[PDB]
């Protein structure tokens, strides 16, 4: 039978207008789906490295770590301290095996950096917004369904846009720019120039930008499942990060 094990991490970030990281949050889970014969016992091995918490004695350094961890009540932790192995007899269907959280710097660079340039004629109503997005993932790695949402001043309309590659889409809707970038890889640099008209009052507020995306074959924390072993079967072990709150001030 089939067994699915997914490490899934929700990333939230707040980045300042100068590019400084103000806040980073990772909420992670390890989710299982399986329908194994009676008797079955499963062992999951995680990154052998990894530390948990902020030890007052040892401190915390570079390396793979989470700030806190919690486990399903059915999980046996006899081999967790020595070997980072979890043991359980799963139910039929879905189970969340482990949850964890991280609020410190990530072990790799943040996946996206934005370089906005805004010129505002107070004036003639002319607003020019140039956005450059750089993907800082490894060059082999992909970001899927990337969308940038940018709230705009009340009553703004679009005069023109120039997008840096033809697969990109952008429109204004509900008072915000929505810019979709379906092709994004580590090292990509994608840009859009938007000419808008801002009406005078009857009769800012630009930003912040919020990115949403999925990062297949990736964890923000660096945590990984090393093995999945069954004792009595096709296995899928997947690692994914995603955000709907990757916020960047303009």
């Amino acid at each position: 039978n089939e067994v699915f094990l997914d490490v899934v991490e929700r990333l939230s970030v707040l980045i300042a207008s100068n590019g400084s990281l103000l806040k980073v949050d990772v909420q992670g889970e390890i989710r299982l789906k399986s329908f194994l014969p009676s008797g079955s016992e499963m062992r999951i091995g995680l990154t052998e490295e990894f530390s948990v918490g902020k030890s007052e004695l040892r401190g915390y350094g570079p390396g793979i770590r989470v700030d806190e961890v919690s486990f399903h009540s059915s999980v046996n932790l006899d081999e967790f301290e020595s070997h980072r192995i979890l043991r359980l007899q799963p139910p039929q269907g879905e189970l969340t095996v482990m949850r964890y959280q991280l609020s410190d710097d990530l072990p790799s660079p943040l996946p996206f950096r934005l370089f906005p340039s805004v010129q505002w004629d107070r004036g003639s109503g002319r607003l020019q917004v140039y956005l450059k997005l750089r993907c800082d993932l490894l060059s082999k790695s992909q970001a899927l369904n990337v969308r940038l949402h940018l709230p705009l001043p009340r009553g703004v309309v679009s005069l023109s846009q120039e997008l840096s590659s033809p697969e990109q889409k952008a429109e204004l809707a509900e008072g915000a720019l929505r810019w979709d970038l379906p092709r994004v890889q580590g090292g990509s640099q994608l840009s859009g120039l938007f000419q808008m008209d801002v009406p005078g009052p009857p009769g800012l507020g630009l930003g912040p930008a919020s990115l949403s995306f999925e990062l297949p074959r990736h964890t923000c924390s660096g945590l990984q499942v090393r093995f999945l072993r069954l004792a009595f079967p096709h296995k899928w072990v997947r690692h994914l990060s995603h955000s709907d709150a990757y916020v960047i001030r303009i």
Binding site: E68, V69, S70, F71, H72, S73, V75, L77, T96, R99
Partner: peptide, 7 residues
């Protein structure tokens, strides 16, 4: 030592 949840 460890925190557990039921769901």
């Amino acid at each position: 030592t460890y925190k557990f949840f039921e769901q």
